[PDB]
Design a protein around this nucleic acid. Sequence first.
DNA 1: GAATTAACTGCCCCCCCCCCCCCCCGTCCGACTGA
DNA 2: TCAGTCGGACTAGACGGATTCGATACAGTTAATTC
DNA 3: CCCCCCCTATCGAATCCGTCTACCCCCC
Lengths: 319, 93, 167
Amino acid sequence: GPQPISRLEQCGINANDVKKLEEAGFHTVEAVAYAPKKELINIKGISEAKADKILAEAAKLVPMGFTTATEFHQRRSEIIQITTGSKELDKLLQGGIETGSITEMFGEFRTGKTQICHTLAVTCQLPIDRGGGEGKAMYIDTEGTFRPERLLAVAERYGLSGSDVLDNVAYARAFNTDHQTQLLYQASAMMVESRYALLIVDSATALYRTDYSGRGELSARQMHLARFLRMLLRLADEFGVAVVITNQVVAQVDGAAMFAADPKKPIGGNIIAHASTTRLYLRKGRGETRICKIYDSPCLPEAEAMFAINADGVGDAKD
Amino acid sequence: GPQPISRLEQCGINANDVKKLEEAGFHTVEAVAYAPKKELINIKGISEAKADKILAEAAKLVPMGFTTATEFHQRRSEIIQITTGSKELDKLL
Amino acid sequence: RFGSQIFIEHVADVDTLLECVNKKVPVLLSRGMARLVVIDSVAAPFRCEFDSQASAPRARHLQSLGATLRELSSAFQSPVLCINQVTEAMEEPLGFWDERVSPALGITWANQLLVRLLADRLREEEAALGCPARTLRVLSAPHLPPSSCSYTISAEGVRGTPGTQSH
DNA sequence: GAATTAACTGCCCCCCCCCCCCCCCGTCCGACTGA
DNA sequence: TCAGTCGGACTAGACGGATTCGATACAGTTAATTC
DNA sequence: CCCCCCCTATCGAATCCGTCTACCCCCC
Ligand SMILES: Nc1ncnc2c1ncn2[C@@H]1O[C@H](COP(=O)(O)OP(=O)(O)OP(=O)(O)O)[C@@H](O)[C@H]1O
Ligand SMILES: [Ca+2]
Ligand SMILES: [Mg+2]
């Protein structure tokens, strides 16, 4: 897909500048082309004229002009969608999880976000004809709730070899927001090295509840979250992978005497509200059955579906 | 298990800096590595460059990268579980 | 004949506005077609060219424009009405202590004026009574005390609310 | 032991009033309803 | 016959607060250096 | 070719966080 940054020096760029760009975090030509001039200026060994030449070469290599809507419609129709393991969820989402956009899931506890993440981590390795993506999976964990036993159970459900499935999942643990952001460069290196098709960040906003406590730290927290979301978006655009993140909820103490009898809204605010493309609202039903609802989408109507959590993972509500 | 914070002396850290870190509640390399930069800056008598150098030295000794799920599953299987004194709860858990 | 006795001009740059006030306006005032000059937004051209590090050229241009406008107004006895924008305080002077907003263009522009007004609107937080609240306030004048009133906008025009002037 | 140089921190004071709901996660059954 | 859906009583209802962020030079105090 | 002497402020940002149970009636 993306063209490696090692093709710039053929256009008249010295190797040291390419190496400096590589430490900067840009590993492809597309990454350099999308970056603004200010980002290139902050490099120690790059001046304004060097940035101008690099941007000119990148724009020469990468098309960034106007296009007819017919071409965009034709190109969009071949994107891949990953099955969620449930027929009702697939029907609700009209195919499954899209690639190239940020999808977010939120809800209270025991609502099944981690189980859905595990199921997506396994099912993304299936052949495209079976609803998969034919790639690898990347799991970034910030809570410590990653269990390969669920992956083994799902693989046994789908008739795959357990050892191979475990070998195709990359796992990293984040201990703070600064470390969480630092993990998105090695991710770029691994993605340019090998073909990946998924990226789970669970939970995306777990550490922000504690790293910034009061109202006096709201602005810095929101700016950091916005930068993190922008990095996720640039990764999704550059490599064409599906980005799935999870969120948490906060109570509505003022209440206003509404019928819900227990109101709650996701955390993150307008930043993550405007940045996410698709959002799913999960809640508990009866026994092991849960309910999923479309909360925001550019092309999907507001509707609900019912799934369940079984011993084999996320699946349809067993009778 | 964890390594004492005294091992940062050999990495090029002032003894007084380690004394301040130990008085601030940090007693192991892991505790320093997991701490965010803004928490280290909060300690009086430590600058931004000093905090960055300390964090780099700490991260040089603690693995904080990407690993496959096979290794995590291998390490997870040697976890210790404590009996609750009842067979029913042990079977349930 | 209201329509035929109003002249409309358009500008896009600071230099264009300077050329307009230097050439076209005196022709209209001298021949007697009009005796009133209105600038829709004096601050708009100056906010798109000069940054925080280019105060001297902006001050020079503002001084030249103010001198020209004052000379024309004094010569032809025609009032000049200038419409200005505002910038927030961003609390960390000029007489604005507890005011959230202040007139733009700094103190150099404020030295060129004679009567300074200010129109303010209280948002739904103070306007949750059903209708917007508008107050017209007098900031400074050589012969007018600092006062205020209220007004409403309707299909007929701007009308002040009777019995509202503050002392 | 000490003259000498180098590195981290610091610069500050005003808001004391109080209608305000808003777009449902109600928990569910009685009955309507058209097929 | 048969389940989706409009509309709604269901024993009972009130409660309040919360803070930060600038772009900058020189002295004070503590820490490292070679004689 | 040489002399003596100066200037002026700007922009707004960004949500969080659940507590608390009460109270008996009625004969063949
Ligand atoms: N092997 C299993 N078989 C059946 N159900 C299981 C199994 N493992 C877990 N569950 C179900 O998973 C539920 C919790 O789901 P999950 O771990 O995804 O929660 P979550 O929404 O991610 O929570 P959190 O907010 O704490 O991160 C439990 O209530 C349990 O019923
Ligand atoms: Ca959105
Ligand atoms: Mg979880």
